[PDB]
Symmetry: C2
Amino acid sequence: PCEKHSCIAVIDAGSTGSRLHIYSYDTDDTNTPIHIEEIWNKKIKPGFASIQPNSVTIDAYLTMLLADAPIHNIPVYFYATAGMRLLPQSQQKKYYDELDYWFRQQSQWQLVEAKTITGNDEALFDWLAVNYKLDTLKSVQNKSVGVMDMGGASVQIVFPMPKNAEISKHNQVELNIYGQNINLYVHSFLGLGQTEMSHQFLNSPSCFANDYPLPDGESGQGNAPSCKEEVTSLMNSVHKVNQQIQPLLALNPVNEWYSIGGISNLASSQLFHFENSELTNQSLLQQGDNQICHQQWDILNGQYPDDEYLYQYCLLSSYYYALMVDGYGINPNQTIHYIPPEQNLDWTIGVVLHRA
Amino acid sequence: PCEKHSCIAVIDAGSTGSRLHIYSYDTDDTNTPIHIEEIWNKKIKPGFASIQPNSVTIDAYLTMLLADAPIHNIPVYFYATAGMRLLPQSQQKKYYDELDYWFRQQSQWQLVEAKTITGNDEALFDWLAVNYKLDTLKSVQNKSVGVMDMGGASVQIVFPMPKNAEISKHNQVELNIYGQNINLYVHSFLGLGQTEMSHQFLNSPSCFANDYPLPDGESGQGNAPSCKEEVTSLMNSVHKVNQQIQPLLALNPVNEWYSIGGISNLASSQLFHFENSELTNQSLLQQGDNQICHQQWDILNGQYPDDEYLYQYCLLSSYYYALMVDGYGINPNQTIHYIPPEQNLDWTIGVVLHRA
Ligand SMILES: [Cl-]
Ligand SMILES: [Cl-]
Ligand SMILES: [Cl-]
Ligand SMILES: [Cl-]
Ligand SMILES: [Mg+2]
Ligand SMILES: [Mg+2]
Ligand SMILES: [Mg+2]
Ligand SMILES: [Mg+2]
Ligand SMILES: [Mg+2]
């Protein structure tokens, strides 16, 4: 495989574990990768930012992740995401000093870069991965495509926008893909991913099914519009989502939205009814409110006893609506396409396109 | 030691690790423990809620924590706190089924109870521990004593309040200590502990020193009143702190406040000037704003290069003021006593008093 084509390894060191992807590819006459295929992968737990940063621990982790890979003497990018961004910087440096030493002691792997990427860099890769799979990159479009990543610890949004001198340079990227210049607005909200954000709402009765036992001893008394208003306060007062995103998106409309991350998991539940791997926010909120928020929990749990995430779906439906409608300003009747787990569309494909 | 006196073991299974405390005590003629002394302790990492819940992992963790203890055939309470409260309940059950089996297979340890305690139960123990050490329990007081725990994942507040039929039963406790009936209001806010809450503010420039490098690439531009207003939005809109606490505290005034948890760490920094192991909120906010928020970061870090927490002290000073003044409604000129690490005052003493 790496005899007849180019190969590259990308490690996604995420909040709950690290995922190695090895890709083969060819390069076309615009100096852009084509024919990108995943030829091997490996996942390890727990997250890199949760292990002790010393040589024995890092050696055992990187050995577990890399030792069995079938191929040798290829470039590697090690990119940590939001879990590492949460750590103080002085603590991050301990990991990277150990990791840099480990890669210098061997030869199977040619380390190009090991770093914590910003959420803006992650948003760029998210947009390239989705558009590669949609086959919208090889041609000038005349339809704006926007991507949202609904991640566990951060969320990303990215969409085409001409260069704007009045906007931070860190929220704008310029790249040329398949011969065409592209300008994207990028943004990430650290802490607004579903797992991290959930930690603020666990004792909010509006966000759980009726009679769900909250950790403080109180009972759920669900109401999606109430839970949404709570979540919208965190989004707009702390993260300033609407103030930053909504005016820009209004002037740079997106014709199609695609979302990666947690929405398919929710949308695929037997409790929801969505078709065409898409949803509208109005439908999402109505179905969460009727089927989970105002539902008696014991009866619901009895009908779906093995779905370990079902209890969060009043909060999650409210939260997705708060982010997309109240934060980004998307119309509640706009279609959002979501991409399933069972597509194995991974943001690391964007690293291949931009950096290989 | 356990030959001449009673003994009891309390395990604090907290967010970042578990701490075993073995106490000796005697019992007075009111059936209340006296002479409570810690005769052994043991700390292990990481947090119980972060390890895999299977028999090999739990056996290795509990062995590491308990095997070396000097004494045998004593009652044990295993109490997990906010880190376990964050986990879904179905996941918590896996831990407790393994733990219950492990204790049934041996005899050094007589397990009384293993559970996740609510933040309300934790607040009760916090108040008893502080008042035991202040020697205010053995006598009827005529001065109301309030306690705040500024924890890593939740915060607690507790103060005397007569029984009120209009208030949740879960936020009120009744107990008799040294022959005297006590009625306390208790409350906990899960997610508002300093570590968990910080995860929402890391890209907020008002909360960091000038030019501090935020994870998204932007620079700190500190301003304590701005960072405080951000934190107050999360406290009052999501957690509803002021709506719940402020009216009750206004009608049930506290004459002395004591705080356990993170404030001593901050207040003890060479950058702050506090005397008498106490502070006022007005002074805390002014000193954070002048010494950290509006301070040039590179120069500050150069003068205090080994203080790994200093970078957070604009956020932390703002956050403590937001919680105490904007959330609980405490006057900015009111003295708050804080108890240092170097007192080893631990909330588990409250378990001895209430349950031994
Ligand atoms: Cl709680
Ligand atoms: Cl419905
Ligand atoms: Cl970021
Ligand atoms: Cl000052
Ligand atoms: Mg090439
Ligand atoms: Mg190029
Ligand atoms: Mg965490
Ligand atoms: Mg007794
Ligand atoms: Mg008694």
